[PDB]
Write a protein that binds this DNA or RNA. Sequence first.
RNA 1: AAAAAAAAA
Length: 614
Amino acid sequence: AAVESFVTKQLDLLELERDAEVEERRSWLKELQSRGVCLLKLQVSSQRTGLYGRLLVTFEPRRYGSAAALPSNSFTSGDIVGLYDGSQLATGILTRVTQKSVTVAFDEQQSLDRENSYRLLKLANDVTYRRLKKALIALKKYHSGPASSLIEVLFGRSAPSPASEIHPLTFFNTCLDTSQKEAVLFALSQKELAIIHGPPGTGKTTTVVEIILQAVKQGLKVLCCAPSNIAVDNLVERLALCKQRILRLGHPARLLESIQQHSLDAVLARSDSAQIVADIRKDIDQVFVKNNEIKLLRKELKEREEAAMLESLTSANVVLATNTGASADGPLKLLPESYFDVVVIDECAQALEASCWIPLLKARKCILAGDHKQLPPTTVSHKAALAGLSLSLMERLAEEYGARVVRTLTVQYRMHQAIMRWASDTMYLGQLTAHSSVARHLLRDLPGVAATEETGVPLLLVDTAGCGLFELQSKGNPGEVRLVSLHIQALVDAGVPARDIAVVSPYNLQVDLLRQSLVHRHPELEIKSVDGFQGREKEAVILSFVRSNRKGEVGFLAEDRRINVAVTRARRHVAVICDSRTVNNHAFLKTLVEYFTQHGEVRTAFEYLDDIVP
RNA sequence: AAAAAAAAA
């Protein structure tokens, strides 16, 4: 069918990816590394247990035995690492990374001492690809189970079965607006597929939660997935507010801290498993004797553990995991197939479609939510990107079916209408609407915050042109750093706390840049890329487009959705700092600066900076 | 061409 060609082409697009990633891996011989994908002169600096009965050790670099340190390749939280003294000393996972620390959670096996020197290696992992391969296959080789119907629908085979016409709804959330209502109504009344298209600020998660509550009222069992841990946990922390009985699939690493309590790991540590661990010590006391043994009784952990987690999985109404966390080799394997009734994928338009097929083969209905007019899933292979990996299951369907399967939230509760309209008129067909409560709010309306030229204006653009604030293989721009700084200080002086402000540029260079010249004078001020700031919001957001050159080159500021995302992070105030001259060679980017100048209060670097040779 | 994130026993 369409599947046994989809799956066959999709595996292709997939190997193009793995390969394009094993390229920029095996390419960049033991110094070029620490830049980088490696940490050396690591001294051990703390040892404890935690999370949950693991070995949490902390490290810090030791130049000539003292500073500093760390230049790490972000070496971000949740990364799998090596650890060397010889060769492979163990394996563990990354809890946090400071520019002084890095802490790693070891799953135990032995110590390990202060009076040594260590190395730490970011390892690569084939699991995400392995499981994506395994998904697609199963989709290909699907008999006649429950997902069968839904499959046909997501692939043209057959059309959408009619409405299940749920008896009208007593809503838990009464302050719900009408778009959200037709949405919720419609999702529960489908039968194979409902798509919640939720633009920035429309309360898409208020809407999904409401859906899930109804589902549990009808006595339905739910799998709730998303591509990232951050997004799952969004839902996990909202479900938990509504008292719902919920389980979140480990590893707790990895997991929002406010919520460890809900991971399969914590539940399992609330017994009954003072017994299973009572003998965890057994097995460790017979690798000692020594001087068929363990096998004899490791059959006991199998049943015991798999007994408890089967129980816990059963006693929850909503089970939550990452798309790839719902792998048929994860805890979901203890459930008979036919266990879940619906599967919600939040942030679907932001995830490889092949992942979605992991959680998707487990229900016979699914709700998809997200905003395909913001960032698509990331692709390392340009070639796959053109071939359509960067296409989301949600987008594809949205393009195909339209209002036959999509319901779209329209009142938004974040942005002042000025900001609101750009994105609206620009990316969402001129249909967004401010809630009568956000449409006129500015920073001067905040408490402690004085009225001011800035704190009193929703939009603002300070121009690089033509003061020759040129750039300089990511992209920085000293002229812009400098500028934000001042506007930053204009905001913090007018009252605005830094905790309520964020600075966002598209390039990682401008970021470290911005950070270096900012972190110390404003510790609680978030500085991050646009891709590292999705879903977030702030009272005031300072953008930095960075690109200024005579050549007219915008880089990837051309990717429309990125820009959209960026502008929509602001509630009461977005100040864009770009170069009029260069930025204008891209239509979208132009009608933006055009907007900022029609209904905005604009300025030119001139008003801000002393040295001026045009 | 582009320089951007995920995920993970």
